Amino acid sequence: MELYECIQDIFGGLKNPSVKDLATSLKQIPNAAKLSQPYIKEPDQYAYGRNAIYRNNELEIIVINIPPNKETTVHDHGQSIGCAMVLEGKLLNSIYRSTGEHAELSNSYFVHEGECLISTKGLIHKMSNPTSERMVSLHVYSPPLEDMTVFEEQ
Ligand SMILES: [Fe+3]
């Protein structure tokens, strides 16, 4: 019983899941950290490593790896929702609101190993690693991301 066998089993049949559903799905992966080890990639295009490992018409699974003191952009997920589980380490998740053309910081909290973060539709966040060790997380997006939008901090 390995990671893809696990994904087809849990995610492969969801139709129109909620961020509720996705969070629960993630927590249903046994030994998720160990399972995804072969799919952890290193920073290529981004400050952070990013590997897409599953996609159907409903969702998209991504493995993310944020080095010490690195961060994502400030982004929304277009028409998609999202949920992520922390496999290893600890991220800081910061929430923003549209300051019009820009965005200002609205809220910030930590997600620890095995814990989940959620992104309701339209939500704008940045993920960062304020720690000295790396952070590996597993993201689901539904539907798959097409129209991501990056904001400049105000
Ligand atoms: Fe995101």
Per the structure, how many domains does the chain have? 1
Q: Which helix H or strand E contains 33, and what residues bound it?
A: helix 32-36
Ligand 1 centre distance from Cα of residue 99 (Å): 19
Instruction: Tell whether residue 125 is among the known ligand binding residues.
Output: yes
Instruction: Tell whether residue 77 is among the known ligand binding residues.
Output: yes
Ligand 1 centre distance from Cα of residue 76 (Å): 7
Structure tokens at 147: 């129209």
Q: Residues 100, 134: contact at Cβ < 8 Å?
A: no
Ligand 1 centre distance from Cα of residue 4 (Å): 22
Ligand 1 centre distance from Cα of residue 140 (Å): 10
How far is Cα of residue 149 from the mean position of the Cα atoms in its chain? 15
* DSSP codes of every residue in 119-136: E-TT-EEEEE--SSS-EE
Q: Which of 62, 67, 61 is nearest to 48 (CA)?
A: 67
Kindly report the CATH number assigned to the domain that includes residue 110.
2.60.120.10
- The whole domain housing 80 covers 2-154
3-state secondary structure of 67: coil
